[PDB]
Design a protein around this ligand. Structure first.
Ligand SMILES: [Mg+2]
Lengths: 98, 58, 90, 174, 58, 49, 116, 98
DNA sequence: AAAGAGTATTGACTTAAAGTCTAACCTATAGGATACTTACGGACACGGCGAATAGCC
RNA sequence: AGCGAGA
DNA sequence: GGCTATTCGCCGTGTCCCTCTCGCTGCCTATAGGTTAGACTTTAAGTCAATACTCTTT
C-alpha cells in the first residue's frame, strides 16, 4: 500500500480565502485549493470556440472582486448570473505600469 | 531525454500559438481563383495509378 | 492562515443582507409608531442613534412617551411571533 | 536581490504568465481517477462529499425551498454537519448540470471535456474508459481537476461544444 | 541601459560615454558661441600668443 | 482547560482546543444592536479563534 | 492544413527596397495588405511605386511584429517591448485573443464574435 | 568569521588586560552551525515513511546543493551512468522526477 | 357591569459618557573636544568592436 | 526562501 | 605616409529554458513636547417604580 491515499488527494473548493496582492483564490489543499486554470487550459478552451465559459472562469470564478459576491447572490437567490466585470489583476497591472 | 524534450515542446507550442493567436475564420468564401496543386497518385512507369502514400494528410 | 484573512466573506455579506431584509419586515408587521422610535433610538433609519430628546422633538412629544413605548416595544418584542423566525441570525 | 518594481512583470513568475492569462478559480475540485466501465460516454463519477461541497450554494437553495431548513443560515448549518436529509436534495440538484474535467497538461483541445456528473460513493472520480486516450490519462495516480460552469452561456457551451460524446474524432487527423 | 540605448541613439552619444555622464564621471558641453566667437578668437589668438610667450620665457 | 477530552472521536471543524483572542475595539452595527436586544443577551467582546 | 496556416502567418510581410516617397523606411517589414493599401493610395495624386520583395521571418519575429503591445509584452522579453511601444506611443486596439483574455472581456472567436 | 572578529578587535585590545575568554566571541560559530542544521540544503528533514525509506535516505548521494550542480544548470551528461559507477553507486535507484 | 391591562403622568435612583485638567511619564532631539584622517549551463541573436587593404589627402 | 515527492 | 572607410572577423551581453499537484522547516546627559491615561465633575441617557385613569373584554 503506497502512501498516496485518495483521502489526502481528494479536494474541493467553492469559496474560501483569496491571495493578498491579487485575488484568484489561494491555491493548495492545505489552505483551500483553487485549481489552477493555467495557460494551456485557456488554449484548449479557445480551441473549442467556447468563449463565455472562459470569460466566466477567468473573471468571476477567479478575480473579479465585485462580480464574485454578485454571482454568489444570484446562485443563492436563483437569479440570472450577472454580466462579468473587469478582473482585478488588470488594474494592478495598470497601476504597476503607471 | 523525456524531460528536456517536453520542455522544448511546450515552448514551441507557446510560440506557434502566439503566431497563430489571430487566425480565425471570417467569411464563408472569397471566390479566389488562386490555389495549390496536390499530386495524389503518381503515374506508374508501366502505366497505372498507385495512390500516393501520404494522401490522407495532403 | 492570516493571508488575506480580513477580506470579504460573501456569506457574512449575504447573511447581513437577509438580516436587514427580515428586520425591516418584522418591524413592518407591527405598528409604525413603535417602528420609527426603534429605528432611530439605535440609528437604523439613517445611521444616527438619537436619544429620547431627539425623538420627542422630531415628533413634538415628550421624551417620557418614547421611553414608555420603546420600553413597550422592547417588552412586546419578546413575542415568539417575531423572535421565532428571527432566532438564528444572532 | 530586492524584487525591483520591474521584476514583477518579467519571466515565468512575472505578472503576465502567472496571474493574468492563468488564474486559480473557485468552484473546482481534484481527485484521483479510477476506471468505471459501467458509465455512459457522456458521464463521469463524482464523489458525494466533493459534489456536496461544490454544490453547497445550490443545495442550500433547494433545501430552503423544500423547507428542510427555515432560512439560509440554518441551511448552511444543515450542510456543514452533513445532516442525513441533505443527500436526496443533492441528487436532485446535481442532475443535468455539466462539468468540465481537465487533466494537466492539456496538450491539445481534447484535454478538457464536459461530462454529466453522477454521484459515486468513495472519493474517486470514476472516469469512462473510452475517453482515457483523449486525456492520455492512465490509472496509476493521475489527478484530474474538475471545474463547474455556472452561467447559462457557460452551461450551454459545456453541454453542447464540450460534451465528451460530441468529440470523438481528433481535431488533428480526425 | 536597454541595448540599443535609446537615449544614446537619440542624442548620438556612445553608450559608455553617456553612462559616464549620467553617473557623474565626465563633463559634457551643452552650448557654444559663433561670430563674436570669430572676433574674440583673434583676440584669443593674441592672448594665447602672450601665454605661450610667457611659458616659453620661463 | 479548553482541551478536547482524551481519546475522543472528532470530526472536521470540531473544536480541538478552545481559544479566544482579545477583540480590542470594533464598531458594531445598529442592526446587530437591535438583534442583540431582540435576544437580550451578552454582546461580548473577546474574539473567538 | 495546420502547417499551411502557420507558414501563411510566416509569409505576411514584405521588405522595402525603394521607399518611393511614402513614409516607408528601407528595410521595413510591412504587411502585404497594408503595402497594397498604400500603393492604391499613392497611385493617384502622383504615382511613386515603392518596390518591395517578399521575405520569410521566424515565428518569434512574426509574433513580436504584431500591432498589439499588450500581447507582445505578454509573450516574451517584456522590458524591451514595453519600452518600444511606449516610445512609439503605440495604442493597442484589443483585437486578438490573448489580449481579450488578459483584460477579461469576451474573445472574438467561436461564441464571441459579433454575429453570434 | 570568528578569527576576523578577533583580528579586528586586536588593534583596540589594551595590552595585558586581555585573556582568551574575553577575547573569543563564540556567537558566529554557533550561529553558523545552527543556520547549517536548519535551512541548509544538505540537512534534510528525515523521511521516516517506513524503516527502508529512512535507511535509504541515508546512503543517499545528492549531486545538488551549496557548491554543487543545480537541476537547471546541470547538463544531461552528469545524469547518465558512468562505467565507474559499478560497485559505488546504484544505476537503478533514482528519482523519476526532474 | 366589573376587572384587568395598558398607556400615560410624575418622581426617584443609576450608570455610562464625556469634557477638563492634571501629572507624570513616555518620547523625540541635541550634544559629547587629547589623538586616530583609504572596504572587502548552453544555444541564438544582435550589437559593440579586432584585423586588412586600398584609396585619398 | 529552502527541501523532498506524484503524475 | 598616415588615416579612414569599406570589408571581414571577433567577443560580450541578454534572453529563454512544460504543466499541475502534495508534505515539511526557516556609551551618557540635558530639554521640551506629546501622550494618552487617568481621575474629577459635570452632564445625558437609562432604569425603577408609584399612581391613576380609561378602554376593552368577558
Ligand atoms: Mg500515469
Amino acid at each position: 500500500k503506497l502512501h498516496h491515499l485518495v483521502d489526502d488527494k481528494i479536494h474541493a473548493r467553492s469559496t474560501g480565502p483569496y491571495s493578498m496582492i491579487t485575488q484568484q483564490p489561494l491555491g493548495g489543499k492545505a489552505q483551500f485549493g483553487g485549481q489552477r486554470f493555467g495557460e494551456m487550459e485557456c488554449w484548449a478552451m479557445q480551441a473549442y470556440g467556447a468563449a463565455y465559459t472562459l470569460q466566466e472562469l477567468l473573471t468571476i470564478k477567479s478575480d473579479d472582486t465585485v462580480g464574485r459576491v454578485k454571482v454568489y447572490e444570484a446562485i443563492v437567490k436563483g437569479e440570472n448570473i450577472p454580466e462579468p466585470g473587469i478582473p482585478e489583476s488588470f488594474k494592478v497591472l495598470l497601476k504597476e505600469l503607471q | 531525454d523525456t524531460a528536456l524534450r517536453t520542455a522544448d515542446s511546450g515552448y514551441l507550442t507557446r510560440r506557434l500559438v502566439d503566431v497563430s493567436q489571430d487566425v480565425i475564420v471570417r467569411e464563408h468564401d472569397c471566390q479566389t481563383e488562386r490555389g495549390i496543386v496536390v499530386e495524389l497518385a503518381e503515374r506508374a512507369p508501366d502505366g497505372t495509378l498507385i495512390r500516393d502514400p501520404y494522401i490522407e494528410t495532403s | 492562515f492570516i493571508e488575506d484573512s480580513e477580506a470579504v466573506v460573501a456569506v457574512d455579506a449575504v447573511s447581513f443582507t437577509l438580516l436587514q431584509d427580515q428586520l425591516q419586515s418584522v418591524l413592518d408587521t407591527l405598528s409604525e409608531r413603535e417602528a420609527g422610535v426603534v429605528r432611530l433610538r439605535f440609528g437604523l433609519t439613517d445611521g444616527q442613534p438619537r436619544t429620547l430628546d431627539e425623538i420627542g422633538q422630531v415628533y413634538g412629544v415628550t421624551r417620557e412617551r418614547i421611553r414608555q413605548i420603546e420600553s413597550k416595544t422592547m417588552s412586546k418584542l419578546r413575542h415568539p411571533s417575531r423572535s421565532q423566525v428571527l432566532r438564528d441570525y444572532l | 536581490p530586492l524584487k525591483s518594481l520591474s521584476d514583477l512583470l518579467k519571466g515565468k513568475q512575472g505578472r503576465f504568465r502567472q496571474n493574468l492569462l492563468g488564474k486559480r478559480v473557485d468552484y473546482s475540485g481534484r481527485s484521483v481517477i479510477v476506471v468505471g466501465p459501467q458509465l455512459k460516454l457522456h458521464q463521469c463519477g463524482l464523489p458525494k462529499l466533493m459534489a456536496l461541497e461544490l454544490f453547497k450554494p445550490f443545495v442550500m437553495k433547494r433545501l430552503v425551498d423544500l423547507n428542510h431548513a427555515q432560512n439560509i443560515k440554518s441551511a448552511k448549518r444543515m450542510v456543514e454537519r452533513q445532516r442525513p436529509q441533505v443527500w436526496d436534495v443533492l441528487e436532485e440538484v446535481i442532475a443535468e448540470h455539466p462539468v468540465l474535467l481537465n487533466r494537466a497538461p492539456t496538450l491539445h483541445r481534447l484535454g478538457i471535456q464536459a461530462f454529466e456528473p453522477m454521484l459515486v460513493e468513495g472519493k474517486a472520480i470514476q472516469l469512462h474508459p473510452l475517453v482515457c486516450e483523449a486525456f492520455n490519462a492512465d490509472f496509476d495516480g493521475d489527478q484530474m481537476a474538475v471545474h463547474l460552469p455556472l452561467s447559462a452561456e457557460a452551461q450551454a457551451e459545456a453541454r453542447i461544444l464540450m460534451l465528451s460524446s460530441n468529440n470523438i474524432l481528433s481535431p488533428a487527423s480526425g | 541601459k536597454g541595448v540599443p540605448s535609446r537615449l544614446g541613439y537619440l542624442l548620438d552619444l556612445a553608450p559608455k560615454d553617456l553612462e559616464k555622464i549620467i553617473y557623474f564621471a565626465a563633463y559634457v558641453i551643452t552650448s557654444v558661441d559663433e561670430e563674436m566667437r570669430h572676433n574674440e578668437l583673434s583676440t584669443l589668438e593674441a592672448e594665447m600668443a602672450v601665454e605661450r610667450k610667457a611659458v616659453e620665457d620661463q | 482547560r479548553g482541551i478536547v477530552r482524551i481519546g475522543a472521536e472528532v470530526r472536521d471543524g470540531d473544536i480541538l482546543v478552545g481559544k479566544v483572542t482579545p477583540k480590542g475595539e470594533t464598531e458594531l452595527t445598529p442592526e446587530e444592536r437591535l438583534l442583540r436586544a431582540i435576544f437580550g443577551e451578552k454582546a461580548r467582546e473577546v474574539r473567538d479563534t | 492544413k495546420h502547417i499551411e496556416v502557420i507558414v501563411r502567418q510566416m509569409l505576411r510581410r514584405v521588405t522595402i527596397i525603394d521607399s518611393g516617397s511614402t513614409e516607408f523606411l528601407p528595410g521595413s517589414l510591412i504587411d502585404r495588405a497594408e503595402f497594397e493599401a498604400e500603393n492604391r493610395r499613392v497611385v493617384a495624386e502622383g504615382g511613386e511605386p515603392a518596390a518591395g520583395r517578399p521575405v520569410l521571418m521566424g515565428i518569434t519575429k512574426a509574433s513580436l511584429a504584431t500591432d498589439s503591445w499588450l500581447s507582445a509584452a505578454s509573450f516574451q522579453e517584456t522590458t524591451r517591448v514595453l519600452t518600444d511601444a511606449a516610445i512609439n506611443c503605440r495604442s493597442d486596439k484589443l483585437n486578438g485573443l490573448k489580449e481579450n483574455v488578459i483584460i477579461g472581456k469576451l474573445i472574438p472567436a467561436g461564441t464571441g464574435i459579433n454575429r453570434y | 568569521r570568528m578569527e576576523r572578529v578577533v583580528r579586528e578587535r586586536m588593534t583596540t585590545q589594551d595590552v595585558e588586560a586581555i585573556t582568551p575568554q574575553t577575547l573569543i566571541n563564540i556567537r558566529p560559530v554557533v550561529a553558523a552551525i545552527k543556520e547549517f542544521f536548519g535551512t541548509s540544503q544538505l540537512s534534510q528533514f528525515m523521511d521516516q515513511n517506513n524503516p527502508l525509506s529512512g535507511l535509504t535516505h541515508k546512503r543517499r548521494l545528492s549531486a545538488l546543493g551549496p557548491g554543487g550542480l543545480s537541476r537547471e544548470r546541470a547538463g544531461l551528461e552528469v545524469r547518465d551512468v558512468h562505467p565507474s559507477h559499478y560497485g559505488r553507486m546504484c544505476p537503478i535507484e533514482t528519482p523519476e522526477g526532474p
